[PDB]
Amino acid sequence: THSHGLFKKLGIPGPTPLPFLGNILSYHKGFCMFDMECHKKYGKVWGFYDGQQPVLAITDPDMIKTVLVKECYSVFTNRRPFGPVGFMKSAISIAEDEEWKRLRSLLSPTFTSGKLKEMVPIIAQYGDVLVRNLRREAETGKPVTLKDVFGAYSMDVITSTSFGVNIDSLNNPQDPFVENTKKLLRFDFLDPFFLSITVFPFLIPILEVLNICVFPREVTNFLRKSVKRMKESRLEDTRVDFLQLMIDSQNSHKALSDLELVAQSIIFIFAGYETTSSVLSFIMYELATHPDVQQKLQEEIDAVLPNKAPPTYDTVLQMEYLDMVVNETLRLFPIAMRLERVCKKDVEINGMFIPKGVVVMIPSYALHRDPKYWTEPEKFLPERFSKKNKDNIDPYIYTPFGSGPRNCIGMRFALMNMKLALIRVLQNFSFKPCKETQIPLKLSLGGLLQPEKPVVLKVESR
Ligand code: HEM
Ligand SMILES: O=C(Nc1ccccc1Cl)Nc1cc(C(F)(F)F)ccc1-n1ccnc1
């Protein structure tokens, strides 16, 4: 069509596109598979079309450095729009250009290491809540789905970190916080809706004026009113909360708005609910099929934390083998699967012309399983990140949280929240592969990096 000849005139390889659709039909196996194939059959740089949108994939570590870090503020500043957002336009992950830079500057102190030390005790409380619910699940003698026990833990952590709501989600699934935020799941960009707007981006403004938001409107309105209630109730009571830290910044760039505060509060829930639980389920599955790693980690946890001691910020950063298990699992399963930046101007990077409007993509999943930089990439060898071998890895081929000024702002929080859970559960429980567990676990063919079947494992007291 009009823009389907852009990659041919630049001498860039890629799958031949079909009219009105581009290469969306090649998504029959999902983004992860499709990127790995195009890597094998085209080399280091290739291109494809999401409808009429040209997407350029780069794998050179220097080019990834230029896009994500070097020329970030100048050229590659924003991600591609993904649908009708409504008032959630002010979310930091959705904000663009000057709005994003202000929001990140006014929200960066919220994710300091010092503020994280102050949040460890609160996250610790629901680690003990997790084992109690896990004790009953283990005594039943039946396999346990890890997605639900971790989702309950992640929900409990989010409600206590973002707000002052202290709830046991597993046994109290009736609080309006628990019910509405339970629907804040990841986006399957290969479902009929997101596929349709990817081929029909012209329908996004139509959806917006219909007040059709990508997020559930009932959940957003409830959470906005809840913050309005809490903001008044916190004043009447006159704290360690993502909200309170934002309140303590609003009263003292230019400023942060009341609606902006609500928007960022919801995005923290959206960025943390399933992502933490999904990675936690992935981590425990890999420990069950490789008990040697599970044994050494359990021994290391007992060494740093004798007599089932409670974890502390400093002790968590001390445990090395736990950091190795988390990193290697993220290498096998980068749940973002991709990193995207929009080229706002005509620019040349590392001797390559990038015309304005092209979406530049970094295939995180494809790079993390590339035989070039990784040895036996299909295996779970957590020793790759040993202190001696933790330098050979290129920090721009392994990008689980992204890189540059637009990386995951909650990387330290997520890593601490995940590790705090892993210490408590492993030092009390051991996990064995039940029959229903798929030993060669298969990944889903949709837009999410999730297993084909929910991971079920046998759990027992230690
Ligand atoms: C283990 C779970 C998580 C993983 C694997 C993950 C990964 C990522 C990735 C790959 C990005 C895109 C970075 C890039 O484009 O350069 C991102 C962005 C972001 N994440 Fe996370 N994330 C996780 C959890 C969280 C949590 C719990 C929070 C909230 C406390 C959070 C807050 C954010 C924000 C605010 C951004 C956008 C930052 C920006 O646009 O400037 N993430 N994350
Ligand atoms: O852009 C993303 N990539 C991603 C990261 C982790 C897991 C899965 C994915 Cl696909 N995720 C994202 C998107 C939004 C937006 F929909 F508002 F754009 C808001 C928050 C996050 N997010 C999740 C975890 N950390 C950040």
Sequence-distant contacts of 341-345: CB under 8 A, at least 24 apart: 341/67, 341/68, 341/72, 341/76, 341/77, 341/78, 341/79, 341/406, 342/76, 342/77, 342/78, 342/79, 342/80, 343/75, 343/76, 344/75, 344/76, 344/77, 344/78, 345/74, 345/75
Name the 3-class secondary structure at 360: strand
408 annotated binding-site participant: yes
Question: If you write DSSP's letter for every residue of 30-64 in order, what string do you get?
Answer: -HHHHHHHHHHHH-SEEEEEETTEEEEEE--HHHH
Closest CA to 175 of 157, 155, 161: 155
Phi, psi of 145 (to 5 degrees): -80, 120
- Cα dihedral 133, 139, 142, 146, rounded to 10, equals 30
| Nearest listed ligand to the Cα of residue 190 | 2
- Ligand 2 atom with the smallest distance to the CA of 85 is 17
Burial of 346 (0-12, 13-18, 19+ CB in 10 A): exposed
Contacts of 423 (CB under 8 A, 6+ apart): 127, 301, 305, 311, 316, 319, 322
Is the CB of residue 94 less than 8 Å from the CB of residue 88? Answer: yes
Cα 109 from Cα 245, distance rounded (Å) = 9
Contacts of 227 (CB under 8 A, 6+ apart): 163, 243, 261, 262, 265
The C-alpha angle 397, 400, 401, rounded to 5 degrees, equals 115
CA of 402 to the centre of ligand 1 (A): 8
> Could you tell which of 93, 282, 340, 399 is best to mutate to test the pocket of ligand 2, judged by most ligand atoms within 8 Å of the CB?
93
276 lines ligand 1 (CB under 6 A): yes
Contacts of 128 (CB under 8 A, 6+ apart): 424
Identity of residue 285? Y
| Counts of helices then strands in the chain (DSSP H, E) | 17, 10
- For residues 415-436, one letter each, b for 16 or more C-beta atoms within 10 angstroms of the residue's C-beta and e for the rest, the string is bbbbbbbbbbbbbbbbbebeee
- Cα dihedral 42, 45, 48, 53, rounded to 10, equals 180
Phi, psi of 268 (to 5 degrees): -65, -40
Phi, psi of 303 (to 5 degrees): -65, -50
| Nearest listed ligand to the Cα of residue 404 | 1
Cα 341 from Cα 69, distance rounded (Å) = 11
- Ligand 2 atom with the smallest distance to the CA of 447 is 10
- Ligand 2 atom with the smallest distance to the CA of 449 is 8
Chain breaks after residues in the chain, where C lies over 2.5 Å from next N? 238, 252
Output the ligand 2 site: residues, CB below 6 A.
91, 93-94, 186, 267, 270-271, 275, 335-336, 408
Is the CB of residue 446 less than 8 Å from the CB of residue 150? Answer: no
CA of 242 to the centre of ligand 1 (A): 15
What resolution in Å is listed for this PDB structure?
Answer: 3.0
Nearest CA to ligand 1 atom 33: 408
Nearest CA to ligand 1 atom 21: 408
CA of 94 to the centre of ligand 2 (A): 9
Cα 402 from Cα 404, distance rounded (Å) = 7
Phi, psi of 285 (to 5 degrees): -60, -45
Paired residues of 46 in beta bridges: 57
Cα 372 from Cα 366, distance rounded (Å) = 11
- 269 to 188, 265, 280, 346, 422: CA distances (angstroms): 17, 7, 16, 36, 20
The C-alpha angle 194, 195, 199, rounded to 5 degrees, equals 115
> Could you tell which of 270, 406, 444 is best to mutate to test the pocket of ligand 2, judged by most ligand atoms within 8 Å of the CB?
270
Pairing of strands 53-58, 359-362: parallel
Token pair in block for residue 143: 């396999």
Token pair in block for residue 267: 């995005």
> Could you tell which of 103, 220, 265, 275 is best to mutate to test the pocket of ligand 2, judged by most ligand atoms within 8 Å of the CB?
275
CA of 306 to the centre of ligand 2 (A): 37
Burial of 186 (0-12, 13-18, 19+ CB in 10 A): middle
Cα 326 from Cα 338, distance rounded (Å) = 19
Domains and their CATH numbers in the chain? 2-462 (1.10.630.10)
Name the 3-class secondary structure at 280: helix
CA of 285 to the centre of ligand 2 (A): 23
Nearest CA to ligand 1 atom 28: 410
Cα 440 from Cα 190, distance rounded (Å) = 24
Sign of CA dihedral 80, 336, 416, 269: positive
Q: Which residue has the tokens 């006159």?
A: 238
Paired residues of 457 in beta bridges: 144
